[PDB]
Amino acid sequence: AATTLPDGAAAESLVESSEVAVIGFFKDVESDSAKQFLQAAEAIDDIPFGITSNSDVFSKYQLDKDGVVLFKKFDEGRNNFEGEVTKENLLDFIKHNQLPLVIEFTEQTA
Numbered sequence: 001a002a003t004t005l006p007d008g009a010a011a012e013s014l015v016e017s018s019e020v021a022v023i024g025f026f027k028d029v030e031s032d033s034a035k036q037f038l039q040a041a042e043a044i045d046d047i048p049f050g051i052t053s054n055s056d057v058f059s060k061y062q063l064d065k066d067g068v069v070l071f072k073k074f075d076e077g078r079n080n081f082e083g084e085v086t087k088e089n090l091l092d093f094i095k096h097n098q099l100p101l102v103i104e105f106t107e108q109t110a
Contacts, residue, residue, distance in 0.1 A: 002041045002049035008060040014050050015071035020098040023050040024068035025058050033085045037068065040090030047094070070097040 005011055005023060014021045026034040029051060041049040061069065061078075068081040070093065081093050 001045065002038055002051040005050045005052040005054070005057060007052075007054055007056045010050065010052075011057050011060060011071075014048055015073070018048050019073050020070075021048045021050065021072075022068070022070040022094065022097070023052070023057070025053075025061070025063050025066055026051060026068070027053055027058075027066045029053050033066065036085055036087045037090065040087035043087075043091055044094065047098075068093070070094065072098055075100060 002024070003010075003014075005014065011023050014023060024034075024037050026037065028034065029037075034051070037049075037051060041047075041051075061067075068085060068090070070079045070081075071077070079093070079097050081089075083089055
C-alpha cells in the first residue's frame with residue numbers, strides 16, 4: 001500500500017523512516033497510470049510506498065511531469081522509472097532498485 005505524502009517534507013522524512021522506500025509523483029493519482037501504482041504496491045507491504053500529486057514534491061526533484069522513482073540509502077540513492085507505468089513493470093523496478101546483485105552464477109549468455 002502507498003501512503004499519502006502531504007509535501008516534500010515527507011519525501012525526505014520517508015526515505016529516513018526506513019532504509020528502502022519509494023515515492024511516485026503522479027499529477028492525476030485518480031487516473032489509470034496511478035491505479036497500477038497502488039495495485040503493484042499492494043504486492044509488497046514491508047516497503048513504505050508513498051505517492052503524491054502536490055507541486056512542492058514535484059519541483060523538488062525537478063519533474064516537468066509525472067514520474068515514479070525509488071529512494072534508498074545504499075548504492076546511488078535515487079533512480080528513474082521509464083517506459084510505461086504498469087504493475088508488471090513496477091514489481092520489476094522495485095526488485096531492480098533495492099537489493100544489489102549477488103556473488104553467484106555469471107549469467108551464461110554471451
